[PDB]
């Protein structure tokens, strides 16, 4: 139940008024929010986040879009939260996503897919370290922890 | 993003108070409503709509049910809206549909499955031409088009 | 229970993705939808709709805004639907409206107040005649009429 | 449409404020509630309910958890309500469940999976007989029965 | 926080599929459900419930309507739950009720106002004693009690 | 439309899973989120926030409760957002609040009223300066600004 993942609401999700609904999906599931901030990060940070894609033809445009508005950055904690978080977000391409997921409810275009979620435990650790100062993670205990686990 | 599909809320969907929720599924996804009207169409129009099924034993009863109350007829526009619209509606037989879809949330009986969606691009074109006068399609641009695509 | 009112979702309501929610407020209350269409009406029709305001300094801009996108025009039927419809919409100025109403949930600016509702029975009759052809009103009986009245 | 299933909201579902939402899933689908009560049943009743699991190492702890708070016991009626009810609940292990189901929206841990549903028609009959006195099942006809079937 | 009130979803509320939403209003507010059952009570019980109205011309019809379908009977517990429960239900006449309340969201006719709530602490005690056997009230402690009070 | 207010979800709101819903109220209204972070601030900061109440008998307990879990701190921007934000939150004492507001939907006890909102423009400025570093306010333009104003 200590696993953590990085979930980010991308500029299109913020612009389209989806902060509340997206948070609610994770909150209602029983996962614990341990960090959150609204940020407009520097270009260098976005280039590091997508470092594995730096040689793709779409990299410059992806970085430009991720700079084009605010981002709601979050760390969520709970059992299997990386993989289950990806399941809640739905398929990366919304055309392949299931209604009932975030992208299956709210998105159409893979290049405007509303949100990001870490794709692995190790990548989650790297992304958490990239987007948050260590002191921004909040230690607390949910009143319903023993009813969720 | 110019593809269009015909979505109709059937008399059971209207009767059961599902107009708002059904519209919201397509609206929240990012698709654009370009035509809509509440109609009680003539029998001839319903027989033409289901022309491919005219030799089925259930055809007369299907037509009678489709005449038994108002229908909310709609044209929705967006990328892959025909196939993704069918995915949002869920399996034609609600027993085979997934929770999170319209039929998986709201319907039980294949003969009372709340809504219709075109099954192909070409059939969508035929259905749009059948149910709407050409001037009833509205040309407009969504303020969030560049955030959806 | 035969009283009718004209409710219109203005271009800002359509643009902001509020068709579904607004319909749901009236639908969930128990009122009966007897006419609906998505329309981009001619300027002359909008000038007639706001004829009582034709001498106001804001008239030209109001007409221009009402022409600036599609409108979801509706006729709703039920007991006291004119006055109760106005109550559901909330105060014309959203700053004076109560949370729980359409404007108190969704709007800020009196000039962008998302929706219109007839202000009297007689004005409702005039507005229904202006916006709808008489054949566009649908006669039907709700399956739950005797549970609402 | 006469098939019945036993659905129970477990103590964790009650504690986490999920009675309303869970009821709504079945209600919105078109199934008919024919029995319901909030109960804190005796240990003997819970041991009989899970009799098929009495030799499992987790049996004592399962019984203790099921005694640890109130349970919302329900009988729902409709076509294929046993299997479709299980589909609405989602996979028994929430990690394997789909967003859009009860467990895929609300639960994480198989030992805290919020709700129970009969796994077969015959087991439903046994569970209904166990949890309800025969007079607690209510005979009524939904006003929209002929619009659901 | 020990005050209790009797809330009943009337046959029209059950018929119109409002059990879930109504429960959610009280559940989300922080009140504690301590008793609930779906019941079709005898005529004598309904006549005793409305004993103070037995000389009204509408008494026979009121009793007949309250017998015409199932009722979801509930006891809710919390600070000021009688008066605040009445506030959540809204004005007895839905025409005088505020959107955001149960009747202001869901009802039109005072004779079909979806729900009942005790009008005073003493009447709540009488109604609880009338509708529930004393053993049907469940003693439990909410995991979030100290976060609500 | 440049006015700003400080809205904070208190530890009870976070604990009870209300971050998403509360954000949605402001988001759906049309206000712009310009700053947000999840924080567990130092005692000194909470004592400064409630400096005007430092001589009240309840001050120590209020500070202790505000330290007892995380807080979701936010800056929202829009016309009349201070006063309208207070209206959205509802009366400070939830017993005096209207259903449809945050406290009228979610809270009971004035000492556990889920959220804080600045009570004046000048106090909002002081609170924004207290809770946020100046660089944490994000400059951006909503895609629907001209449809809200």
Swiss-Prot record, chains A, B, C, D, E, F:
SMART domains referenced in this protein's UniProt entry, alphabetically: NDK
Catalytic reaction annotation: a 2'-deoxyribonucleoside 5'-diphosphate + ATP = a 2'-deoxyribonucleoside 5'-triphosphate + ADP; a ribonucleoside 5'-diphosphate + ATP = a ribonucleoside 5'-triphosphate + ADP
Pfam families found in the cross-reference section: NDK (PF00334)
Residue numbers annotated as active site: 116 (pros-phosphohistidine intermediate)
GO molecular function: ATP binding; metal ion binding; nucleoside diphosphate kinase activity
InterPro entries referenced in this protein's UniProt entry, alphabetically: NDK-like_dom, NDK-like_dom_sf, Nucleoside_diP_kinase, Nucleoside_diP_kinase_AS
SS bond partners: none
GO terms (BP aspect): CTP biosynthetic process; GTP biosynthetic process; UTP biosynthetic process
Key words of the record: ATP-binding, Kinase, Magnesium, Metal-binding, Nucleotide metabolism, Nucleotide-binding, Phosphoprotein, Transferase
Cofactor or coenzyme needed: Mg(2+)
Domain of life: Eukaryota
EC id: 2.7.4.6
Binding site for ATP: 10, 58, 86, 92, 103, 113
Quaternary structure note: Homotrimer.
Biological function: Major role in the synthesis of nucleoside triphosphates other than ATP. The ATP gamma phosphate is transferred to the NDP beta phosphate via a ping-pong mechanism, using a phosphorylated active-site intermediate.
HAMAP family linked to this entry: NDP_kinase
Family matches, as PANTHER family: NUCLEOSIDE DIPHOSPHATE KINASE
Family per similarity comment: Belongs to the NDK family.
Name of protein: Nucleoside diphosphate kinase
Source lineage: Eukaryota, Fungi, Dikarya, Ascomycota, Pezizomycotina
């Amino acid at each position: 139940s200590n696993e953590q993942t990085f979930i980010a609401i991308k500029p299109d999700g913020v612009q389209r008024g989806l902060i509340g609904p997206i948070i609610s999906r994770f909150e209602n599931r029983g996962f614990k929010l341990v960090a959150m901030k609204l940020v407009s990060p520097p270009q260098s940070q976005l280039e590091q986040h997508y470092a594995d894609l730096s040689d793709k033809p779409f990299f410059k445009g992806l970085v430009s879009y991720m700079l084009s508005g605010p981002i709601c950055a979050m760390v969520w904690e709970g059992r299997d939260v990386v993989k289950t978080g990806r399941t809640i977000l739905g398929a990366t391409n919304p055309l392949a996503s299931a209604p009932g997921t975030i992208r299956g409810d709210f998105a159409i275009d893979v290049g405007r897919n509303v949100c990001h979620g870490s794709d692995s435990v190790e990548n989650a650790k790297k992304e958490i370290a990239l987007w948050f100062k260590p002191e921004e993670l909040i230690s607390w205990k949910s009143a319903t922890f023993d009813w969720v686990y």
